[PDB]
């Protein structure tokens, strides 16, 4: 409804669960980041059935549509107007995204320029007054 | 200008050269295609002749009350039965030499007394027997994969066999069948041309995979009944 | 006025002794009690109909408590006429022993 990007097909991702550390649930001193379990007894390194999954490159997503925002574009960060005009040529496949530190004094101006150039901006109504 | 307009009078001569160049390419490959049509006529006359000879020889032997015995057939199709883990050192090396490195892929094997004593050493690991023409007629067509540098390429065309293998006179696919079927003088480089036949698992199921086919099971020699098996694994 | 779909019971997933494969159902289908008798049902649409408190509908106009997972029969299974059925999205496993309607929508007579 917003700007309708180019050819971007059906998006399969081979897993939508984001691998957890072995025994992340048991504790809160084990943070949910993945770290390779290196025990000499450990079942998950040993890849038993009924345990959790280790990552490997078999889950690597399709190179045609890697790094896909669901609309179709690919994101690109920006802080001001001069860095925003750099998608005047490549706008209908990459989308801008205003950074979290830009003030509403300036966010009104960046999203102003995004209207004229027809560049998708993915936090458009953010930090309004 | 006057010089380039002088070449556009000469361009009608130029496109004659463009005509002539496309032209001989057309009539090479046309009369190279008429060749392939008549070599198969000669084989279809020939395989009828070699097949009906063995009937005709036996029938005038039985008439005069005398046994005909045929020549011990000189080409066996070999398919591997068992696996990889738990392999003797002597049979480790032999199945490498017969291009049977994984399970259920197979080649043709030139039978010979040097090659017979290989197939005793790897008796539990293979199932083998003399094929039929119909079995070889299917394998090169359906599962024809050939290597050129490395990189097994599906055959798909006779230009692949013309360059990679027609050094001896076997430029097309039915010449490849005759040299494979009737073992001639160039069976070695035709058999090296084919990648190993990566078959399927059988349809009906095997029978015990370990004992010899004499014991009712499935391993070993079987002498015509591998035509029965190669319809399953194809 | 009357019933246009045939009745069949859901029996479980296409499983091994230890592992399951949850993405393909199994159907004990009523009336069919032979491998040879199920040359008819190959390719019919199943429909697992169930109840839930919010409202989703179809061209019958008014929003209803009736929700449906679709799917269709692949091939026969075993010798007793038990029949596989690949749905679009898989079963809940609540429905083991409940009913999936076997239609007459796709016809090969």
């Amino acid at each position: 409804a917003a700007l309708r990007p180019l050819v971007k097909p059906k998006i399969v991702k081979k897993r939508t669960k984001k691998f957890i550390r072995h025994q992340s649930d048991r504790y809160v001193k084990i943070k949910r980041n993945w770290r390779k379990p290196r025990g000499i007894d450990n079942r998950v390194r040993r890849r038993f059935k009924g345990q959790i999954l280790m990552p490997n490159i078999g889950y690597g997503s399709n190179k045609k549509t890697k790094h896909m925002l669901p609309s179709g574009f690919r994101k690109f960060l920006v802080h001001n107007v001069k860095e925003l005009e750099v998608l005047l040529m490549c706008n209908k496949s990459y989308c801008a995204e205003i950074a979290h530190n830009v003030s509403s004094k300036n966010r009104k101006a960046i999203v102003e320029r995004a209207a004229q150039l027809a560049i998708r901006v993915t936090n458009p109504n953010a930090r309004l007054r | 200008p006057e010089t380039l307009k002088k070449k556009r009078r000469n361009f009608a001569e130029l496109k004659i050269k463009r005509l002539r160049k496309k032209f001989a390419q057309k009539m090479l490959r046309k009369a190279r295609r008429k060749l392939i049509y008549e070599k198969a006529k000669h084989y279809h006359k020939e395989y009828r002749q070699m097949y009906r000879t063995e009937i005709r020889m036996a029938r005038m032997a039985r008439k005069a009350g005398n046994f005909y015995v045929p020549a011990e057939p000189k080409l066996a199709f070999v398919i591997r039965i068992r696996g990889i883990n738990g392999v003797s050192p002597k049979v480790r090396k032999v199945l490498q030499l017969l291009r049977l490195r994984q399970i259920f892929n197979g080649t043709f094997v030139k039978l010979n007394k040097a090659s017979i004593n290989m197939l005793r050493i790897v008796e539990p690991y293979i199932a083998w027997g003399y094929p039929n023409l119909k079995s070889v007629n299917e394998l090169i067509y359906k599962r024809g994969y050939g290597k050129i540098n490395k990189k097994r390429i599906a055959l798909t065309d006779n230009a692949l066999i013309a360059r990679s293998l027609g050094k001896y006179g076997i430029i097309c696919m039915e010449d490849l069948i005759h040299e494979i079927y009737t073992v001639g003088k160039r069976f070695k480089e035709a058999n090296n041309f084919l990648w190993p036949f990566k078959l399927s698992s059988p349809r009906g199921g095997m029978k015990k995979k370990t004992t010899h086919f004499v014991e009712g099971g499935d391993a070993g020699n079987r002498e015509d009944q591998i035509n029965r098996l190669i319809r399953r694994m194809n | 006025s009357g019933r246009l779909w045939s009745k069949a019971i859901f029996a479980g997933y296409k499983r091994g002794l230890r592992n399951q494969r949850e993405h393909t159902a199994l159907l004990k289908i009523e009336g069919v009690y032979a491998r040879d008798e199920t040359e008819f049902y190959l390719g019919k649409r199943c429909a697992y109909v169930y109840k839930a408190k919010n409202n989703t509908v179809t061209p019958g106009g008014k929003p209803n408590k009736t929700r449906v997972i679709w799917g269709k029969v692949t091939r026969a299974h075993g010798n007793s006429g038990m029949v596989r059925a690949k749905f679009r999205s898989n079963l809940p496993a609540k429905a083991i022993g409940h009913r999936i309607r076997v239609m007459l929508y796709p016809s090969r007579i």
Binding site: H67, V86, L88, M89, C90, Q116, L117 | - | -
Partner: protein, 122 residues
């Protein structure tokens, strides 16, 4: 020695942006935005760039002089075009194709001249 300038600048330049994605050239003379060899406009002796018009309406086109190098005040010659969106499409085609002046990157000059008017016309 244009490739000498490329093998220095192709990384470790200024105004090179590497965030979340591809590099971007962000260079004062360039048509597309890629840090590439062909769309790079400090390096070449013959460069084509189009820009907006600070007058408010029109497209200005930047070309390098080719007469005097290493003289960066006089090394650029510029000219504006304000026409009816079709004659300014052909004039930039005439000035590129009907000279030897970079027959490469024809379309990228035009697509920017395409795009920058539509930002400018409503």
């Amino acid at each position: 020695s244009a490739h000498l300038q490329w093998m220095v600048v192709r990384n470790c330049s200024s105004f090179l942006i590497k965030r979340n994605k591809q590099t971007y050239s962000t260079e004062p003379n360039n048509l597309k935005a890629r840090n590439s060899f062909r769309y790079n406009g400090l390096i070449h002796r013959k460069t084509v760039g189009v820009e907006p018009a600070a007058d408010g309406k029109g497209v200005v086109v930047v070309i390098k002089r080719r007469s005097g190098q290493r003289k960066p005040a006089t090394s650029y010659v510029r000219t504006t075009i304000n026409k009816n969106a079709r004659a300014t499409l052909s004039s930039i085609r005439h000035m590129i194709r009907k000279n030897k002046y970079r027959p490469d990157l024809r379309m990228a000059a035009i697509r920017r001249a395409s795009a920058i008017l539509r930002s400018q016309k409503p």
